[PDB]
Scaffold this active site. Structure first.
Site, PDB file in Angstrom:
ATOM      1  N   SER A 217       0.677  -1.125  -0.127  1.00 48.40           N
ATOM      2  CA  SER A 217       0.187  -0.276  -0.081  1.00 48.40           C
ATOM      3  C   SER A 217       0.774   1.298   0.063  1.00 48.40           C
ATOM      4  O   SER A 217       1.565   1.539  -0.920  1.00 48.40           O
ATOM      5  CB  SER A 217      -1.045  -0.032   1.015  1.00 48.40           C
ATOM      6  OG  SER A 217      -2.062   0.815   0.980  1.00 48.40           O
ATOM      7  N   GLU A 350      -8.906  -6.106  -5.088  1.00 55.13           N
ATOM      8  CA  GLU A 350      -8.473  -4.880  -4.210  1.00 55.13           C
ATOM      9  C   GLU A 350      -9.510  -3.930  -3.777  1.00 55.13           C
ATOM     10  O   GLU A 350      -9.258  -3.609  -2.415  1.00 55.13           O
ATOM     11  CB  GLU A 350      -7.223  -4.034  -5.154  1.00 55.13           C
ATOM     12  CG  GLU A 350      -6.070  -4.695  -5.453  1.00 55.13           C
ATOM     13  CD  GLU A 350      -5.142  -4.432  -4.352  1.00 55.13           C
ATOM     14  OE1 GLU A 350      -5.269  -3.792  -3.437  1.00 55.13           O
ATOM     15  OE2 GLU A 350      -4.029  -5.328  -4.444  1.00 55.13           O
ATOM     16  N   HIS A 470      -7.462  -5.970  -0.696  1.00 56.21           N
ATOM     17  CA  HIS A 470      -6.244  -5.164  -0.463  1.00 56.21           C
ATOM     18  C   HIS A 470      -5.755  -5.536   0.967  1.00 56.21           C
ATOM     19  O   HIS A 470      -6.469  -5.409   1.916  1.00 56.21           O
ATOM     20  CB  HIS A 470      -6.524  -3.556  -0.392  1.00 56.21           C
ATOM     21  CG  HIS A 470      -5.516  -2.663  -0.265  1.00 56.21           C
ATOM     22  ND1 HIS A 470      -4.396  -2.525  -1.261  1.00 56.21           N
ATOM     23  CD2 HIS A 470      -5.196  -1.932   0.780  1.00 56.21           C
ATOM     24  CE1 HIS A 470      -3.454  -1.688  -0.923  1.00 56.21           C
ATOM     25  NE2 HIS A 470      -3.785  -1.329   0.270  1.00 56.21           N
TER      26      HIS A 470
END
Length: 569
Positions: A217, A350, A470
């Site tokens: 991230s 995601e 994610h």
């Protein structure tokens, strides 16, 4: 807005309490002293639930604590010490809002890193893996209840995890050159940590000539920034960019005007001058400033999809420590990091990270009627109402709205591409167009299980939710307080060994393939080529398979938004 249920607040606090006592039962009585350039440090030998063991040094200072006049400034090197410094416990995290409890936590005294290895006198000088945690540059830590080394230390490597200043304390930016707050202090912390590692990893058995930097991230954006800036030229030798890079829209902003916005929310009743605004912020209690970071963005910035008030920025003037002198789009064209082996990837769903955002405000789903607000800013007019921008939005709506009525899954799928897949594609192509950069390897994490999870699942209300969101892959690289021992023949356990194997293999050789990894024997895993019109990747599921990237058709449609402004792509 991520509101965690009260039922879940109690569960988390219970698990953290059990985890504290497990950690007691895992710690041994054995300790070890190692050298650093600033003085000796003492670490402790710990067990894992799998009954491997490792030496653990946490709270190693790499900078002076950024208190007092050092607040908002670039980090400075720490004061050396005599005697042995105790590094058997963690230090505080950077000041932030705890994403579960919602209360401010952490401390300005947060510039520390942790070093872990199963052997302090190895028969080789081992690859060094340096992890930069994500969290939007506003949350996160290197505490072992989130980023435990228990899986990595199964291999003969050195794992180092770092902290860096977050939010306003890491990323205030002021135009007035005389104030010497150009911005990106938090990235300058990472720079000083990386220099410490090159200079000290040998003291823990690591290879200073074989260091891998990886992050997830905002940590992958950070890892990429560390491959872009001249401050770090030559400091490491591989990069892994997981679910984010420096050309992601959310990873940079011109925030120089927001210092006045945050001071006034904290009570400042002076004029809008940089010197007067800074003097107030230097006196403010740190937790007051960080609690109000939520409400700094304006409406116009919200609709323009600016995620965070404070974060990385293009610095408005040059200093000795400047990390970003130009936009990352331009820095990529001459980045030293284009010449080191690189692996990038995302998960297979995601956008699942945004499930409560669209559950809380279903009015968000109207944005998919025109999709005007998802047209990238550089292609849109000021008010997002010119007919060209509506034509671009229709292209976005064609790609993601499946039926005639937009749905929540449509919105999440669009998020996957807007925030992650499309900036990955843009990065790969601008490398090919302007650089001799080395071919990049692509993975796609697509293993779905809830037998073991990680705390980010709490944040996105992912309990019971199918799909590989994610940050779901972190579960299979790092131990955390929600984990448990797994049977050796189980699908979750094999995925751990596969992920740690691939990451460690890539760190060792710059090539993530090895036939000695279960599931890769009859597989050939090639990097991306300039002429590739469809990307191939390693899809990591219950089975390991090389496949055409399933996102490729939607990625091509996002690229078509630029065919009338190809110079901006």
């Amino acid at each position: 807005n991520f509101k965690v249920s009260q039922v879940e607040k109690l569960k988390w606090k219970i698990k953290c309490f059990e985890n504290k006592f497990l950690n007691y039962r895992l710690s041994t009585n054995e300790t070890a002293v190692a050298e650093t350039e600033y003085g000796k440090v003492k670490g402790i030998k710990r067990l894992t639930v799998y009954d491997d063991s490792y030496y653990s040094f946490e709270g190693i200072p790499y900078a002076q604590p950024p208190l007092g006049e050092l607040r908002f400034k670039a980090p400075q090197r720490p004061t050396p010490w005599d005697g042995v410094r105790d590094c058997c416990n963690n230090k505080d995290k950077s000041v932030q809002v705890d994403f579960i409890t919602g209360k401010t936590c952490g401390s300005e005294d947060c510039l520390y890193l942790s070093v872990y290895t199963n052997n302090l006198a190895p028969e080789t000088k081992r690859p060094v893996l340096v992890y930069i945690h994500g969290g939007g540059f506003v949350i996160g830590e290197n505490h072992r209840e989130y980023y435990g080394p228990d899986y990595f230390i199964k291999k003969d490597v050195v794992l180092i995890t770092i902290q860096y200043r977050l939010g306003v304390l890491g990323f205030l930016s002021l135009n007035s050159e005389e104030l010497n707050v150009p911005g990106n202090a938090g990235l300058k912390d990472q720079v000083m940590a990386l220099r410490w590692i090159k200079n000290n990893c040998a003291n823990f058995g690591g290879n200073p000539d074989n260091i891998t930097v990886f992050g997830e991230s905002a940590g992958g954006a950070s890892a990429h920034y560390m491959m872009l800036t001249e401050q770090t030229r030559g400091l490491f030798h591989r990069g892994i960019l997981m679910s984010g890079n420096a050309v992601c829209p959310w990873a940079i902003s011109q925030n120089q005007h927001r210092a006045y916005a945050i001071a006034k929310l904290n009570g400042y009743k002076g004029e809008n001058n940089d010197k007067d605004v800074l003097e107030f912020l230097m006196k403010a209690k740190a937790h007051d400033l960080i609690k109000l970071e939520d409400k700094v963005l304006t409406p116009e910035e919200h609709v323009n999809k600016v995620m965070f008030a404070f974060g990385p920025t293009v610095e408005p003037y040059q200093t000795a420590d400047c990390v970003l002198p130009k936009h990352p789009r331009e820095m990529v064209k001459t980045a030293w990091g284009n010449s080191i082996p690189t692996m990038m990837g995302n998960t297979s769903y995601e956008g699942l990270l945004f499930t409560p955002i669209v559950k809380q405000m279903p009015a968000l789903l109207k944005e998919l009627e025109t999709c005007a607000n998802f047209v990238p800013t550089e292609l849109a007019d000021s008010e997002r109402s010119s007919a060209e921008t509506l034509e671009l939005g229709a292209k976005i709506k064609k790609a993601h709205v499946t039926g005639e009525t937009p749905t929540n899954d449509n919105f999440l799928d669009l998020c996957s591409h807007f925030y992650f897949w499309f900036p990955m594609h843009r990065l790969l192509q601008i490398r090919f167009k302007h650089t001799s950069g080395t071919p990049v390897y692509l993975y796609r994490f697509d293993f779905d299980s809830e037998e073991i999870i990680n705390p980010y699942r709490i944040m996105r209300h992912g309990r019971g939710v199918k799909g590989v969101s994610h940050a779901d892959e972190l579960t299979y690289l790092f131990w955390n307080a929600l984990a448990k021992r797994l049977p050796k023949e189980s699908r979750e356990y094999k995925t751990i060994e596969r992920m740690v194997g691939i990451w460690t293999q890539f760190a060792t050789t710059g090539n993530p393939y090895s036939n000695e990894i279960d599931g890769l024997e009859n597989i050939i895993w090639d990097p991306i080529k300039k002429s590739d019109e469809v990307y191939k990747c390693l899809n990591i599921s219950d089975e390991l398979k090389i496949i055409d990237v399933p996102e490729m058709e939607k990625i091509k449609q996002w690229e078509s938004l630029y065919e009338k402004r190809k110079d901006l792509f």
